[PDB]
Amino acid sequence: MFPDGFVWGTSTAAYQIEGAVAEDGRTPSIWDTFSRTKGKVVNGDTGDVACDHYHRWEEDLDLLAELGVQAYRFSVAWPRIHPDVTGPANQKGLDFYQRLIDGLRDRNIIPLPTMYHWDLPQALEDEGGWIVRDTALRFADYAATVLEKLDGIDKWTTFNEPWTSAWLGYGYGHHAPGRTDIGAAAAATHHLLLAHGLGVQAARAIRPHVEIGLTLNLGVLRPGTTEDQDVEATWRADGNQNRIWLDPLFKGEYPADMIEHYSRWTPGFHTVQNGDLEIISSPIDFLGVNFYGPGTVMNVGREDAARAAGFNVEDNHLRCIGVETPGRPKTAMGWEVDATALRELLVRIKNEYTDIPLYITENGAAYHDYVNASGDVKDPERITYLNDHLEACLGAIDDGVNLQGYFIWSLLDNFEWGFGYSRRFGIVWIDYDTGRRIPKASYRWYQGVVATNGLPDL
């Protein structure tokens, strides 16, 4: 049912699956130090070993080959390429990824590498991190090195979810580096987008050749009630989630109301200099989209109207709360499931912002899997999840949205950040103590979807 040249695939990160945090001269990133700080990650889990992808890379390529995907999305580690941030390129770090790229090209699998998947070197974090403009500058120097040295790449991705690096990392303190400062996150918002622009600019100079875009975790947010108080609150969360990223990238300006909302904090958007938006709005070839589930939104301190509307129910700077729908399915993360939201998102991007090729670079869900007596890992709710969301994509394509790809998160059960290894997104099960790869029911089901280029009827 899908188009002729539809790109199937699956996504991973660097820190989440690679491991070998010290091998070949790799320096500790912000997640090395954040995970080793107590109370930050469940059970004090770190990414020292993880899936051990750094050694078992050739096994994972063969899994991709047997799965039969057209493209494999992954991340290149900043601390591997430039351990010395200002210093020269570490050849050992460049050799690992080139070998990975070459292996993928051998199996006729298109590599889609990401420059930044939240693993910022600690040395830049000590000097302010994304709060300061300097870090955005030395990303471009990192980006340029990876743009020039690594060959065999046609498509590049600058950033993976700038919202999470900034607002969870500096705003709420869930992710690395783990600060609780609004002005710090609003500053990171600009400098991440700026560093994206510099990455795109670095691309067009070194490699006119290659297409380059970025990955965003955009959200679909719905008002719980139709009152002003609740609808306006939905508009604030929408702006923070989407519009403070989409408007700069595709219209060269920040939203008026979000700038007005974030006018209070410092540094924040005081770091916005004249000419930055022209850098940020550098024309990109494609847009990466990360969706999981929508969110019913109401105003802050509006719990009674929420419960009176039939719903169920870290400082609220956005002045809005999320509310739960009783009947709606949830994942192991606690996120609601509604495939129709993915359609609403892709159609909105088509209409309001950009008409460039779109790729679902990250779509999946956590479920509590286990190896049963026979040795199989049965996850029917993940298959249902992937299937339901893919029929939404079929609808978006029927609507006329330029959707040219889909990527399942993830290939492997990985280090799920704040929750450590206690949440599993992969379609391939992992025994962390041994490093064994057990394909789940999803892998087998997805293999049929990929090969036949369409969804089998369950």
Added chain:
Amino acid sequence: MFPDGFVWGTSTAAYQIEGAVAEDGRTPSIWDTFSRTKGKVVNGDTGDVACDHYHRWEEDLDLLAELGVQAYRFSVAWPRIHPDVTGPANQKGLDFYQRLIDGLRDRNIIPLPTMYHWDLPQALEDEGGWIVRDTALRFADYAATVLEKLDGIDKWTTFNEPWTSAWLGYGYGHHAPGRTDIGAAAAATHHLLLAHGLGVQAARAIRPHVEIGLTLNLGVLRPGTTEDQDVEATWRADGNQNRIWLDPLFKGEYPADMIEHYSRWTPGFHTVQNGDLEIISSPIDFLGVNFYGPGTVMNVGREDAARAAGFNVGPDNHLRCIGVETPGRPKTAMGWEVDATALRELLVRIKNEYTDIPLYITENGAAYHDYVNASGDVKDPERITYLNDHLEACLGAIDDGVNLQGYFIWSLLDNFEWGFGYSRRFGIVWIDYDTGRRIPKASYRWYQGVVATNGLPDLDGHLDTLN
């Protein structure tokens, strides 16, 4: 911190850990046929292989000895002992449990076997199951067989959670045999209690010196509001959960208000013949107590007033009452609300309203989503936090004057969690089912110290060693 002769232990069940369902002449139990039915258990799971404790019994005994516990609860499988109930005892079945009991005493661990843990033979179910009276009689013969032919047992248990056997099995259809009939469950209620009573009396004649009791899963139910409507709705829910068991056992009568409530369904409590209540109320030496957490109760069709009060609610009802979730309180992997202070109220209530006999927490524990890490460990801090808080409440009960003389953690092994298959994990020992491998969790090492020191270490301090 705890009393001197306090008995620490841990509990298991027959069908949940043993496996080898079609070996040595063992016949299908109700959970054999139930789990093999379409869409009764998660992912179509059964107890065919399970923890493979039937072949790995000696390994688990060694774990029990290394854990340092004074006792170990387990279930003796009815279908393994009497494949055909009309027929004689399967010797191969008897020798498995005798060798297990011998191994327990050789490792100086007190054996506390349970006659019935929900594995009623399928042949008995086909003839009505616990609905009919003859099933209760056939149990007395079964109890007689095990009481006689198994040596080394000082403390016996007749039934593990009659409520779950009756109401989840015959009333709501969530458990084996899977029936949805109120009269059937009310009948099973009486015949389970009757089978316990006959089992107690059978003990007095065959093994005079042994102590015997039963295991009940009692609940602590709080009214959602202070209105008459919800308080009385909780009183109905309390009758089903607690009082239609406690009053027959310790008062020798059914609660009048519950008899009036259940009179409309047949067979129900019309199956009560003359002199049953005296059999049911046969004096028992101890009472097994199961508790996992409380539940807030409100009247039926009162979802709106619940949300108005500040609760969360989801989307027949013979008890005419619903459950509501207090949003603030923590949940386990099951979804059950955690509140250790409720266990203290339950124990004190049993002391005041009913009996002063020795009590044992035969089942207490929680389910969480454990995982084997790169270091090979299975750290479960929330389970340590759970057990600690509940043990702190036990020390309160013991201070209050409650005759609590023991404590058993559910469970020893990550086993077949009935309806939820292997997807939910309760144990203190992780299980790799595909190989059969066993990995003691952080709770095991925590409990190992608690049992050894006979007291609770600092909770926040011990969590620091698990990072």
